[PDB]
Amino acid sequence: GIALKNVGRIKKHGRKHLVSKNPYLRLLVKLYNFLARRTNANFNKIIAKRLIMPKRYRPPLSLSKLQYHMANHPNDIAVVVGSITDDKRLFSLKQLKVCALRFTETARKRIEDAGGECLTFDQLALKYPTGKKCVLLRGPTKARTAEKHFGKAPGKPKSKARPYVRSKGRKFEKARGRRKSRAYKK
Amino acid sequence: AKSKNHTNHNQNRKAHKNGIKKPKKHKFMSRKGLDPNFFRNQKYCLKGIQKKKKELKLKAKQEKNN
Amino acid sequence: AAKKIKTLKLINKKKRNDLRQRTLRYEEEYESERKKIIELKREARKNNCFYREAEKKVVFVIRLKGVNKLPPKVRSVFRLLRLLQVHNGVFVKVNKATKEMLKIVEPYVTYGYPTLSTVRKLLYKRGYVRVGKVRRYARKKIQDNADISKHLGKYNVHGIEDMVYQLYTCGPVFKKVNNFLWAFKLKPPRKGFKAKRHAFNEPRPGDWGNREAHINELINRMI
Amino acid sequence: KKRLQNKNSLTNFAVRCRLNPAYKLLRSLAVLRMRKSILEKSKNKKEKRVQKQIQKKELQKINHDYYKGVAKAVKKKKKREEKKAK
Amino acid sequence: KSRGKRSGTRYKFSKKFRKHGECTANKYLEKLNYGDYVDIVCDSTQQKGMPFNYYHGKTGKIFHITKRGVGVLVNKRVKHRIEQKKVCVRIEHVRKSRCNEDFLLRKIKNAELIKEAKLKNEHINIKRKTEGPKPAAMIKVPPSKIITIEPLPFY
Amino acid sequence: IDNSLNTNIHQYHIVGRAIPTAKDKNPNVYRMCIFAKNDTNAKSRFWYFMKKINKLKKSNGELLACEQIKERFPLRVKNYGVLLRYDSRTGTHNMYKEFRDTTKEGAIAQLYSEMAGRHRARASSINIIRISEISSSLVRRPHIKQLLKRRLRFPALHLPTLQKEYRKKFASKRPSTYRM
Amino acid sequence: AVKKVGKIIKKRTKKFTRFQSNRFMRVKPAWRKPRGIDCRVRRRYKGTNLMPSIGYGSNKKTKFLLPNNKYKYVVKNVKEMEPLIMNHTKYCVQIAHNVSSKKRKQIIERAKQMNVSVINAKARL
RNA sequence: AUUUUAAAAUUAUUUGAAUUUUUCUUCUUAUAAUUUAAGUUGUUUCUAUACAGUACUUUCUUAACCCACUCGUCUUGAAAC
RNA sequence: CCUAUUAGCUGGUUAUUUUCGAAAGAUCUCUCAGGAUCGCUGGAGUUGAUUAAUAUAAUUUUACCAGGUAGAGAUAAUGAU
RNA sequence: AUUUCACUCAUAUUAAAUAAAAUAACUCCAAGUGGGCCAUUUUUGGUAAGCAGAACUGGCGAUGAGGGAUGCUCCUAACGC
RNA sequence: UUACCGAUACCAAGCCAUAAAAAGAAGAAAAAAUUUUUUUUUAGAAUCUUUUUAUGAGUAGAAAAUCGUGGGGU
């Protein structure tokens, strides 16, 4: 008998393997696991970790946010482990070198028309195997509507969680506990 | 019928199973209900600082970018 | 294309020489300290005066009880001392803080002042070391000075004799050496205990508490 | 590396000298000191004992003083008890 | 059955023997700034601004200061976790804490000490010394005062 | 030396003293003779008596000396009178007992065995005060007095205690307790 | 008790039997984990029907091979024996139960000229 | 199949030094070997000069020493009268 | 026949190994054989750590606080006597 | 008070000690549970109770093994082969 | 006062699994006969391969990986 925590076995949390059985993504994961092991590059380690993540942690990054994040250094290349989506609110693009998992058709067309280029992660591993001049970016991992229902329960004081309701008219979840005139408010 | 009214047995070890969690102690705290006429004047202070900084930044950017 | 091995070998040779010189100086220091205490007690007693020796600065603690039925404070102190199994042994440097920690665990341990030969025996025949990355230590028997050099070399502690010196004389690098050293896993005593239930200082046979120099014979039977 | 047998660092001479580069020198010195002839010690035992007569006298004096102090405590306590008897 | 505000405070919220009466006028001159530590010691002579029973004898940090009151953040243990509680009291029930006074004096003393040591380019150890085993001492006592001790009989 | 025969009581001379404070520059030092199994137990007993008699505890004290006392003539038999204080199940009593043997520690071991045997007094209930060698003319107990005759002799009526090797299970004829 | 035949250690023989299968006919001896409440075997009372556990697992260097130090491979015709042409030293062959006498003879002769040993070589003859 | 290496120790020669002054004194200078390094190797028998036995493997049946209450279930607690 | 009505209640609830592993407190409840809710638990995932150090700690030390239980007292008060 | 510039306050042992401290923190989804009982110490009602009610910790429950002849809770000690 | 006996606990060693870690996407070795033959092997599956260390009770409950059955594509 020995008095250890968790009986002496180190416990890790989070993903350990790719779940997607996409052969191309499996090949990419193999390549970047090898790259992360054989080079010291935290760049490659981060990319190898992010290729493994669920969909909700590879959110899209719009063109406007891409070109805003890459404003100050214009000759670098931006690498996103999500998808790049178009932004109709953006009036003009400018000469972006972007590596990404996937591009929507509109975003790809706009980037090539602006004269930049779209890169896959195998091309990124070919040309910048260490990540020189490569800026790691990610989209908003907490903007999705599911997070709007998370956190403190709707009903706890000063809670911002969205409740689960069929509809959102005046007669749905809006009388008692949501205004001072009916018992209390939140 | 008659039951155990109350006990605190096992409650402490339940509490220590996931530790006695400490408050996070964030660097900044909301000033919502705190010292009006002081934090409003602090808002004015910060606005003055930002405007004085930003007009210098605009001047320098304009004169370096023609 | 072959200068690297030559440089590595030369550096190893220089390290061996420095370790040898350091160990010879250590032996001279042990002998000088023993002779000094002998002659100084002699002089004190020749004069009409008393001489009180320094406290020993380092203790060796052996756990006595198992893991069941222990108060939370005792369990916490045990974890802080790294005494997790029934016959585990550790070196604990002596100060007010550790003495007060040892007080709350006194009924479940026995400890005492180790002396140099027993320190050397413990490290040489039961000395295992925490080798790996930080928090990934992988207990390994010493068998060589390479890992001692790798982890403790920046404090010039290349060598098991350096480890022995720092443990025996509570020197500048004691916390690092003691932490680098995996907790000793001792055998049951060769002739048995007397009664783990009762204090060593009780008039009846007993084992727990501070044994002072008497820890050496128990360690020798347990090694 | 593959785990091999853990050699006894105390009795396996090669590994002991590997671990302690000074051990072979120390052991040779101890052995050479052991190998001294019995004639010198047999002829110098009295020389090495007769130097300690003064230490023996001082030792006797301190133990005598300790015994005398104990006996005087005995006498004082007995005298006090005889005082309180009446 | 009974759990009012001041339940159980018969002795804690009573003024000490010959220590009754309102606070001294000097208490109102005590300087308080944001973020400094404070003890909550309820003064039963002042009934308004009185803290709850639990916080008597607790230390906290100032998070708010009003014209006659202070808001202090106090850790309270609630089953499986601690949480900050914003207790609002009047100034009579609060007192500047000495919990870090040795820390402040240590900061000044070490400031000057390491300033002079760095001036004389000496590497000094500045941490507290946690005194443990004392060295040997060659101490002489006149034998006229060495007292022999014997266990005592029964009377 | 026969370890089956030796007991593990030794006499220790212990000198201690309170740590000098700012109140008193140098406290008076105390000395005591304590019989114990080892010097560690002797020091524990010394501090116990320091605290009980004086108001001095180990945490406020320091040990100036602790050395084992060896009997001058461990092969000369002498008579010891030992004063004693012990608490029974219903009170505390001081008594005086007499032994004779070669060492003070041996006499104390006899004392412990006899107090346990006669009064069920555990060693934790015994306080030894004042063991001292006495003269034959001042011996008071009859069981010691009868040991000091001009010529002392008696038969050997004890049963033989053979070795294990010859303690054989089946005998060929009934042995004699008369032997002699 | 463990049995050793060269490098092959079988950490236990006499395979585990279901609790009370000895004294109930409706309880077959095939092992089932006693879920129970006061179940003796589940509680690991002394002197009854010990349960299998992973500790009994055999050394994985010698885990699946037969007393001939060869892994068994079951074949249904002559075409399934091609891979053994370059595994003849570490694999032995066994003819499937439902193979007729001609295919059996053909398999035996092909295995013999491939010098691959056959386990059930004398079946249906 | 590019650390069972290197080092360490030992033996035999070898250069210088040191010292406790030498037939196990130590420190390196070089070479050659060894293992005390760098987790068991050798010899001789037998099985046996057989083709399945009285041997060896294995299943089963019987004993013998020690141990072993009836499972499932509700229950704080079931072998439960 | 509606109807396989309803049951906060009793009974039952079917392969293996491996890993983690409780509660019998609490708040509300026409609530007291029930439920929701918190706590305790698993699984999933991210952020971190992977740098013998920071976060951290049912531990001590140093410094500083708060207390009226044991004891004590009855001539300090009150209430007894 | 905030903002910007200065200057610089141990770190080469870490602003006290010790720490298989990141086996962390956080989020999500969800199970079972929500009759407990026992021992030491404290303790209320009761003449008392293997009685009823509480406090701390450890257990039994959910757990075998060695000992206590026997024994859910005692002692040792917790469990791969 | 000694010696001894005595656990599924402790110690050394082996093996199984769990957790973590170090690391990894190409060349002849031996033996037996008689320079020539013969016998073995001559590896490279990434939820994989090699090696290392620690660890292993468990009801209710949870998960993973495995084992089977009827039927359907291939």
Short mmCIF file of C-alpha atoms in Angstrom, two decimals, chain C residues 30 58 60 82 89-91 114-129 140-145 148 152 157 159-168 173-174 177-178 180-186 219 223, chain D residues 7-10 16 19:
data_model
loop_
_atom_site.label_atom_id
_atom_site.label_comp_id
_atom_site.label_asym_id
_atom_site.label_seq_id
_atom_site.Cartn_x
_atom_site.Cartn_y
_atom_site.Cartn_z
CA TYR C 30 35.56 14.16 7.89
CA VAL C 58 19.86 16.39 9.39
CA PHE C 60 16.68 10.19 8.70
CA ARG C 82 7.61 11.96 0.78
CA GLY C 89 12.88 6.43 4.55
CA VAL C 90 13.88 10.00 3.77
CA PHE C 91 16.45 12.57 4.78
CA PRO C 114 22.42 8.98 10.37
CA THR C 115 26.26 9.18 10.56
CA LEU C 116 28.51 9.03 7.53
CA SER C 117 28.90 5.28 7.07
CA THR C 118 25.15 4.75 7.12
CA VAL C 119 24.58 7.66 4.74
CA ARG C 120 27.10 6.08 2.39
CA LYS C 121 25.52 2.63 2.72
CA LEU C 122 22.04 4.01 2.08
CA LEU C 123 23.12 5.81 -1.07
CA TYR C 124 25.37 3.05 -2.36
CA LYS C 125 23.05 0.08 -1.95
CA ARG C 126 19.55 1.61 -1.76
CA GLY C 127 20.13 4.87 -3.61
CA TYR C 128 17.68 5.43 -6.43
CA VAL C 129 17.36 8.71 -8.26
CA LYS C 140 16.59 4.58 -11.56
CA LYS C 141 19.34 3.03 -9.47
CA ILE C 142 22.45 5.17 -9.60
CA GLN C 143 24.91 2.70 -11.17
CA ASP C 144 26.83 5.65 -12.67
CA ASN C 145 27.43 9.36 -12.18
CA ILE C 148 23.85 12.95 -11.12
CA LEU C 152 22.90 18.37 -10.18
CA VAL C 157 27.48 17.77 -7.46
CA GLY C 159 29.05 12.18 -8.20
CA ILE C 160 27.58 9.96 -5.52
CA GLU C 161 30.33 11.03 -3.14
CA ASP C 162 29.19 14.64 -3.60
CA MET C 163 25.67 13.45 -2.85
CA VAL C 164 26.93 11.72 0.30
CA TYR C 165 28.85 14.77 1.47
CA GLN C 166 25.95 17.15 0.97
CA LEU C 167 23.53 14.85 2.78
CA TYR C 168 25.83 14.08 5.71
CA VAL C 173 23.01 21.92 -1.83
CA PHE C 174 20.82 19.76 0.38
CA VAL C 177 20.18 16.51 -3.60
CA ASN C 178 17.46 15.27 -1.24
CA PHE C 180 16.73 14.43 -6.59
CA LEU C 181 17.01 11.28 -4.49
CA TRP C 182 14.02 8.93 -4.67
CA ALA C 183 12.54 8.00 -1.30
CA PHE C 184 14.34 5.00 0.13
CA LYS C 185 12.38 1.75 0.15
CA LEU C 186 13.74 -0.18 3.11
CA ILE C 219 18.84 1.32 9.31
CA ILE C 223 19.00 -2.14 4.56
CA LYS D 7 25.52 -4.10 -9.89
CA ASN D 8 26.29 -3.90 -6.19
CA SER D 9 28.03 -0.54 -5.93
CA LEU D 10 29.68 -1.62 -2.66
CA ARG D 16 32.53 0.94 -7.09
CA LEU D 19 31.23 5.58 -9.00
#
